Amino acid sequence: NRPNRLIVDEAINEDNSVVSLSQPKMDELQLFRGDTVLLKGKKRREAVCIVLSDDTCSDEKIRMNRVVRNNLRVRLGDVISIQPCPDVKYGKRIHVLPIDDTVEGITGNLFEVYLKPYFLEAYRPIRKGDIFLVRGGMRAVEFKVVETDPSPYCIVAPDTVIHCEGEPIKREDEEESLNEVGYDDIGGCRKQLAQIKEMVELPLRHPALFKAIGVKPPRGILLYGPPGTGKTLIARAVANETGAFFFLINGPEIMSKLAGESESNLRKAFEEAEKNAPAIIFIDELDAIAPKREKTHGEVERRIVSQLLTLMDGLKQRAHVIVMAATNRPNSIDPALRRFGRFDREVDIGIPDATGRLEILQIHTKNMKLADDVDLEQVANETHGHVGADLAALCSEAALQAIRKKMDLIDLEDETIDAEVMNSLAVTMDDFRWALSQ
Amino acid sequence: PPGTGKTLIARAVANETGAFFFLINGPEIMSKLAGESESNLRKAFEEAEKNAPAIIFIDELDAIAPKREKTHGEVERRIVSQLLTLMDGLKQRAHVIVMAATNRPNSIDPALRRFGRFDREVDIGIPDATGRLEILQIHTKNMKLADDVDLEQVANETHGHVGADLAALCSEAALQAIRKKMDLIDLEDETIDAEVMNSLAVTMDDFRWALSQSN
Amino acid sequence: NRPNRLIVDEAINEDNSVVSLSQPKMDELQLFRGDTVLLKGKKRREAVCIVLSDDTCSDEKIRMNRVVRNNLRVRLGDVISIQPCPDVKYGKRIHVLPIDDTVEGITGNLFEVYLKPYFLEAYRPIRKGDIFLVRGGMRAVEFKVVETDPSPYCIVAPDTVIHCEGEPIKREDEEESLNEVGYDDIGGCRKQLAQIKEMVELPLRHPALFKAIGVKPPRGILLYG
Ligand SMILES: Nc1ncnc2c1ncn2[C@@H]1O[C@H](COP(=O)(O)OP(=O)(O)O)[C@@H](O)[C@H]1O
Ligand SMILES: Nc1ncnc2c1ncn2[C@@H]1O[C@H](COP(=O)(O)OP(=O)(O)O)[C@@H](O)[C@H]1O
């Protein structure tokens, strides 16, 4: 009895201007694959998009990517209205400008470098006030649409004139950076990723539920696993992606403080994260603060260990605050914390398998011109047992290996580099092959 | 073992025999400043004799009173004795009782079991199946369960779970129902009336799920 | 489309007054083995040198040693211009002086001890304002050229009078000590030495790159052993 409302869920097709429904739901709203749909959302906000069928997608849900949700002002698991839009006319004029903080650095002709291959032969449906993302020149450029000739909303057919005029613009207060971290930056471990959300879904997203029912959320979540395996990442993702307030407790950064002033921080950390709730408090490197008491030869070394557990209990359910933690192994840390009062919930962010490796390889190659011979599938399948820092630097150094060759050539020119010089810069399977020796 | 119902039983007994209850939460003391740690520990007793007959309950005793081999510390140990002073300063006739909870006998200082103070020691072990079932029942008591919900089965498969394990198992299996009906409610967009809640059923497939989650 | 510009790379012949190109690059600039070449570099700076063929050397690159690069004001991997110089006349007078901090200690006749066996039968191309290094007497002596009779630049043939006159001189602000440590002081481990440079090449040498690209350098390097 509310058909056109829908839930928001992950993109499987990560093109900017494509949303995906189930096959029934298209039959329900009398929509056709390829039709331009219009979606409305919070803060009076509209986006226009191309609809497609997804066999996997649940009837209730709609798959879309950050670019989209951003202009709608929603986060994952929110609700929006979708209605057809076969009244959209081809555009004559589009006045697009870049957001200054995605362009400080690269120089040259954005019109040519990013906009041209993006819009080319796509017939994209845009809208006055959209914010979109282009991937090249070893970075991402964010563009806002200031005016279109068929206002508000128009299609971009080959015919369309694209006004690149003048200034890079400043970022508005509530428009988040598509540069910022999110789930689409994560790879390999999908299972765990879910388990996290669903625990944290209700208390973060529907915080007023738990004052109204006697039931209790998680308070604490712990992250197992090898180092650099995406722990610090996932956490910052989840908060940014569920719009939660984020406060970081960087283990060593506390232990570096003066005695007692260590605790003084640890309080204010919580104290603030209850003021700005619903919140994640994230403890990176927990074994730096809370090791097994056998390891704690120290009065003040231990004073903190308890000081934590005090605040971890002083944490109300109804404060709707959650604490996530990251350590290197369970044995590292004090057992008391896994007392089913505080860090009851414990996730094994392990290693990637080949499919996961591949996924991650993809995630860092996303802003680079790869050559046709580049076979990431291969790269993954031989790199048994690599974490997503391993695989991420593997990219970085294989890119730097291409930059070195073209760099010799550039040095003869002696010129600093325009984006255009960057866009022409290819990365090869022999540039990868190399970074493998490391 | 931890979360086995120790902190529970204690607060039950006091509420159920109308005794005055004062809680000494181990870490909560050790989190204090040196000496102000002791200053509390006195007032704790001092008050519990004023409000007698009373149970003074020490949750997580191994936090305050570990084996002296573990107590590399002057003030870490100063407290350990400060307890034993008050445990003796406890009159019989004060009709006050102290209950304590630790994770294992080896955890704690042997002196306390000196037949002066903690002479009496109870083994709150794990549940058997019948006990599990009992506990499952105890947290399902405010929820509409579906006819297919067979707690008997749940208990019977869940070998070796403590009553925190089994209690959260419920909580998350309920949250798992709340999620589905929650999708549906989100379309309404309404916050929830009790009436909405009363209609909210919990299923064996809602339970089945919360089983994947491990402890 | 800029042929005469070249990259700077390690010396394989560590004689002071010899630079080495590839065999194609000599055919490209129409240079002959033994020809006196003139090289220009940053801060208005010139050096003059003898060119040779190196089979190993990459066409793009030029092999030279610290003595050289110093007077050019460049470090490894920089760019310079090389042009022939068959107009260099034999020298009559050369007014050379030592730099005080490479001579406090040793006493005696520098003219005889260091300059004489150095210049002997070499036909070295020097230049007014060059800084060169001599190896003997259990140390290294650094000499600056204050004036030459065919100014600015001249060859040193047996005929040449070498004026050793007077004072040791102080070091100028930007002229680094060739006494100072460098790669030519290193031995054995060649592989590692490369691996280091290349990591540290881009961020140290081209530091404004990494504000302009999302890619990241190394931050830390550790040394086992
Ligand atoms: N699965 C992954 N997907 C994408 N990036 C990853 C992944 N795993 C690791 N990374 C990269 O490596 C780094 C991971 O470090 P992090 O999770 O912060 O670990 P830790 O706290 O374990 O040191 C991140 O900066 C990220 O760019
Ligand atoms: N036998 C049981 N019957 C009912 N509930 C239990 C039982 N054992 C544990 N629980 C539940 O789990 C928690 C037990 O925690 P607690 O007794 O405080 O453990 P500890 O002091 O052992 O950490 C309680 O909050 C309670 O709801």
mmCIF file of C-alpha atoms in Angstrom, chain B residues 5-178:
data_model
loop_
_atom_site.group_PDB
_atom_site.id
_atom_site.type_symbol
_atom_site.label_atom_id
_atom_site.label_comp_id
_atom_site.label_asym_id
_atom_site.label_seq_id
_atom_site.Cartn_x
_atom_site.Cartn_y
_atom_site.Cartn_z
ATOM 1 C CA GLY B 5 24.709 -15.284 35.640
ATOM 2 C CA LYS B 6 26.910 -14.236 38.561
ATOM 3 C CA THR B 7 26.154 -10.467 38.577
ATOM 4 C CA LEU B 8 22.590 -11.503 37.901
ATOM 5 C CA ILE B 9 22.094 -14.024 40.752
ATOM 6 C CA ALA B 10 23.470 -11.584 43.236
ATOM 7 C CA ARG B 11 21.143 -8.703 42.301
ATOM 8 C CA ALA B 12 18.299 -11.211 42.207
ATOM 9 C CA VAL B 13 18.936 -12.504 45.724
ATOM 10 C CA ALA B 14 19.045 -8.985 47.201
ATOM 11 C CA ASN B 15 15.945 -7.753 45.371
ATOM 12 C CA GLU B 16 14.146 -11.010 46.222
ATOM 13 C CA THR B 17 15.098 -11.079 49.911
ATOM 14 C CA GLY B 18 14.571 -7.298 50.140
ATOM 15 C CA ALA B 19 18.125 -6.787 51.314
ATOM 16 C CA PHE B 20 20.004 -3.598 50.756
ATOM 17 C CA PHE B 21 22.276 -3.934 47.753
ATOM 18 C CA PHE B 22 25.587 -2.249 47.228
ATOM 19 C CA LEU B 23 27.663 -2.869 44.145
ATOM 20 C CA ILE B 24 31.434 -2.752 43.963
ATOM 21 C CA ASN B 25 32.234 -2.972 40.350
ATOM 22 C CA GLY B 26 35.839 -4.134 40.196
ATOM 23 C CA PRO B 27 37.239 -2.088 37.310
ATOM 24 C CA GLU B 28 35.125 0.912 38.394
ATOM 25 C CA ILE B 29 37.305 1.079 41.543
ATOM 26 C CA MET B 30 40.625 0.444 39.769
ATOM 27 C CA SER B 31 39.728 3.274 37.359
ATOM 28 C CA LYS B 32 39.813 5.650 40.315
ATOM 29 C CA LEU B 33 42.748 7.592 41.560
ATOM 30 C CA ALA B 34 45.130 5.762 43.915
ATOM 31 C CA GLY B 35 43.797 5.843 47.522
ATOM 32 C CA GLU B 36 40.480 7.346 46.395
ATOM 33 C CA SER B 37 40.128 3.698 45.245
ATOM 34 C CA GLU B 38 40.293 2.671 48.964
ATOM 35 C CA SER B 39 38.197 5.688 50.074
ATOM 36 C CA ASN B 40 35.346 4.265 48.005
ATOM 37 C CA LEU B 41 35.859 0.701 49.229
ATOM 38 C CA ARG B 42 35.397 1.894 52.793
ATOM 39 C CA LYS B 43 32.247 3.989 52.140
ATOM 40 C CA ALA B 44 30.846 0.977 50.265
ATOM 41 C CA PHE B 45 30.968 -1.150 53.384
ATOM 42 C CA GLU B 46 30.300 1.818 55.753
ATOM 43 C CA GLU B 47 27.014 2.494 53.927
ATOM 44 C CA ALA B 48 26.032 -1.186 53.584
ATOM 45 C CA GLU B 49 26.260 -1.509 57.436
ATOM 46 C CA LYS B 50 23.997 1.615 57.786
ATOM 47 C CA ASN B 51 21.441 0.107 55.394
ATOM 48 C CA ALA B 52 21.737 -3.483 56.680
ATOM 49 C CA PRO B 53 20.687 -6.241 56.392
ATOM 50 C CA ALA B 54 22.720 -5.976 53.262
ATOM 51 C CA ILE B 55 24.512 -7.692 50.492
ATOM 52 C CA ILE B 56 27.670 -6.047 49.352
ATOM 53 C CA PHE B 57 28.428 -7.410 45.954
ATOM 54 C CA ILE B 58 31.829 -7.369 44.340
ATOM 55 C CA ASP B 59 31.600 -7.888 40.604
ATOM 56 C CA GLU B 60 34.936 -8.853 38.963
ATOM 57 C CA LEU B 61 36.967 -9.449 42.095
ATOM 58 C CA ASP B 62 40.092 -10.490 40.236
ATOM 59 C CA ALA B 63 40.301 -6.840 39.187
ATOM 60 C CA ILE B 64 40.884 -5.759 42.780
ATOM 61 C CA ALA B 65 42.410 -8.843 44.416
ATOM 62 C CA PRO B 66 44.690 -10.929 42.284
ATOM 63 C CA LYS B 67 47.421 -13.312 43.431
ATOM 64 C CA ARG B 68 50.330 -11.280 44.931
ATOM 65 C CA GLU B 69 52.629 -12.620 42.110
ATOM 66 C CA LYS B 70 50.360 -10.528 39.812
ATOM 67 C CA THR B 71 50.494 -7.497 42.171
ATOM 68 C CA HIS B 72 53.697 -5.743 40.990
ATOM 69 C CA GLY B 73 52.631 -2.510 42.669
ATOM 70 C CA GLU B 74 52.559 -0.851 46.073
ATOM 71 C CA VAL B 75 49.174 0.794 45.645
ATOM 72 C CA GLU B 76 48.002 -2.234 43.527
ATOM 73 C CA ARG B 77 48.490 -4.288 46.724
ATOM 74 C CA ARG B 78 47.548 -1.597 49.308
ATOM 75 C CA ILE B 79 43.999 -2.095 48.170
ATOM 76 C CA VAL B 80 44.243 -5.944 48.327
ATOM 77 C CA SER B 81 44.935 -5.658 52.054
ATOM 78 C CA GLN B 82 42.409 -2.740 52.507
ATOM 79 C CA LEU B 83 39.735 -5.153 51.403
ATOM 80 C CA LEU B 84 40.758 -7.903 53.831
ATOM 81 C CA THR B 85 40.753 -5.288 56.684
ATOM 82 C CA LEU B 86 37.122 -4.446 55.985
ATOM 83 C CA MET B 87 36.205 -8.090 55.318
ATOM 84 C CA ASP B 88 37.380 -8.808 58.851
ATOM 85 C CA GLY B 89 36.006 -5.478 60.253
ATOM 86 C CA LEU B 90 32.695 -6.924 59.059
ATOM 87 C CA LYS B 91 30.915 -8.069 62.219
ATOM 88 C CA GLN B 92 28.837 -11.285 62.168
ATOM 89 C CA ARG B 93 26.176 -9.230 64.036
ATOM 90 C CA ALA B 94 26.243 -6.527 61.352
ATOM 91 C CA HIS B 95 24.194 -9.249 59.560
ATOM 92 C CA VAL B 96 25.805 -8.009 56.406
ATOM 93 C CA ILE B 97 26.943 -10.396 53.792
ATOM 94 C CA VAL B 98 29.430 -9.964 50.975
ATOM 95 C CA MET B 99 29.123 -11.839 47.713
ATOM 96 C CA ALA B 100 31.805 -11.799 45.101
ATOM 97 C CA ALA B 101 32.227 -12.813 41.521
ATOM 98 C CA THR B 102 35.364 -13.828 39.731
ATOM 99 C CA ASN B 103 36.230 -15.824 36.638
ATOM 100 C CA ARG B 104 38.342 -18.493 38.396
ATOM 101 C CA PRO B 105 39.724 -19.339 41.854
ATOM 102 C CA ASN B 106 43.304 -19.111 40.518
ATOM 103 C CA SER B 107 42.552 -15.567 39.376
ATOM 104 C CA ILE B 108 42.216 -14.318 42.918
ATOM 105 C CA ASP B 109 44.352 -13.908 46.030
ATOM 106 C CA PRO B 110 44.153 -17.047 48.270
ATOM 107 C CA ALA B 111 43.927 -15.002 51.476
ATOM 108 C CA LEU B 112 40.316 -14.058 50.804
ATOM 109 C CA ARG B 113 39.157 -17.690 50.928
ATOM 110 C CA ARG B 114 40.668 -17.678 54.426
ATOM 111 C CA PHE B 115 37.812 -19.178 56.337
ATOM 112 C CA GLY B 116 37.377 -15.786 58.063
ATOM 113 C CA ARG B 117 35.998 -13.942 54.995
ATOM 114 C CA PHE B 118 35.111 -15.854 51.814
ATOM 115 C CA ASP B 119 34.705 -19.192 53.531
ATOM 116 C CA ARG B 120 31.703 -20.056 51.284
ATOM 117 C CA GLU B 121 32.315 -20.662 47.536
ATOM 118 C CA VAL B 122 29.724 -21.611 44.888
ATOM 119 C CA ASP B 123 30.442 -23.095 41.464
ATOM 120 C CA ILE B 124 28.094 -21.312 39.019
ATOM 121 C CA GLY B 125 29.265 -23.521 36.118
ATOM 122 C CA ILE B 126 27.582 -23.829 32.703
ATOM 123 C CA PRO B 127 24.061 -24.826 31.723
ATOM 124 C CA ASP B 128 22.987 -28.282 30.543
ATOM 125 C CA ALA B 129 20.243 -28.532 27.890
ATOM 126 C CA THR B 130 17.400 -28.315 30.375
ATOM 127 C CA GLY B 131 18.997 -25.217 31.841
ATOM 128 C CA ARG B 132 19.613 -23.716 28.422
ATOM 129 C CA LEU B 133 15.967 -24.214 27.573
ATOM 130 C CA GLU B 134 14.971 -22.584 30.852
ATOM 131 C CA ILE B 135 17.073 -19.527 30.004
ATOM 132 C CA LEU B 136 15.894 -19.317 26.430
ATOM 133 C CA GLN B 137 12.430 -19.212 27.953
ATOM 134 C CA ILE B 138 13.406 -16.436 30.321
ATOM 135 C CA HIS B 139 14.286 -13.935 27.532
ATOM 136 C CA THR B 140 11.584 -14.939 25.074
ATOM 137 C CA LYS B 141 8.978 -14.016 27.736
ATOM 138 C CA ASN B 142 7.995 -10.561 26.334
ATOM 139 C CA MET B 143 7.812 -11.474 22.675
ATOM 140 C CA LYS B 144 5.292 -12.931 20.283
ATOM 141 C CA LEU B 145 6.934 -16.226 19.198
ATOM 142 C CA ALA B 146 5.540 -18.116 16.202
ATOM 143 C CA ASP B 147 4.104 -21.654 16.489
ATOM 144 C CA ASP B 148 7.082 -23.089 14.573
ATOM 145 C CA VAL B 149 9.523 -21.619 17.194
ATOM 146 C CA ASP B 150 10.911 -24.722 18.956
ATOM 147 C CA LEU B 151 13.134 -23.470 21.773
ATOM 148 C CA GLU B 152 13.589 -27.158 22.827
ATOM 149 C CA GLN B 153 15.441 -27.682 19.581
ATOM 150 C CA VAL B 154 17.432 -24.437 20.032
ATOM 151 C CA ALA B 155 18.625 -25.414 23.429
ATOM 152 C CA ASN B 156 19.340 -28.958 22.397
ATOM 153 C CA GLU B 157 21.745 -27.978 19.621
ATOM 154 C CA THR B 158 23.449 -25.062 21.489
ATOM 155 C CA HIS B 159 25.921 -27.196 23.546
ATOM 156 C CA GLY B 160 27.940 -25.145 26.059
ATOM 157 C CA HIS B 161 26.411 -21.693 25.981
ATOM 158 C CA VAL B 162 26.203 -19.447 28.961
ATOM 159 C CA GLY B 163 23.187 -17.387 29.772
ATOM 160 C CA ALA B 164 24.651 -14.281 28.240
ATOM 161 C CA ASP B 165 25.247 -16.273 25.019
ATOM 162 C CA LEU B 166 21.674 -17.578 25.062
ATOM 163 C CA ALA B 167 20.285 -14.148 26.075
ATOM 164 C CA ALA B 168 21.876 -12.236 23.240
ATOM 165 C CA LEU B 169 21.005 -15.117 20.890
ATOM 166 C CA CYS B 170 17.405 -14.091 21.565
ATOM 167 C CA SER B 171 18.053 -10.326 21.351
ATOM 168 C CA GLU B 172 19.649 -10.656 17.873
ATOM 169 C CA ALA B 173 16.988 -13.166 16.637
ATOM 170 C CA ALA B 174 14.340 -10.618 17.646
ATOM 171 C CA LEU B 175 16.299 -7.773 16.047
ATOM 172 C CA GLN B 176 16.349 -10.079 12.940
ATOM 173 C CA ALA B 177 12.517 -10.078 12.847
ATOM 174 C CA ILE B 178 12.432 -6.359 13.599
#
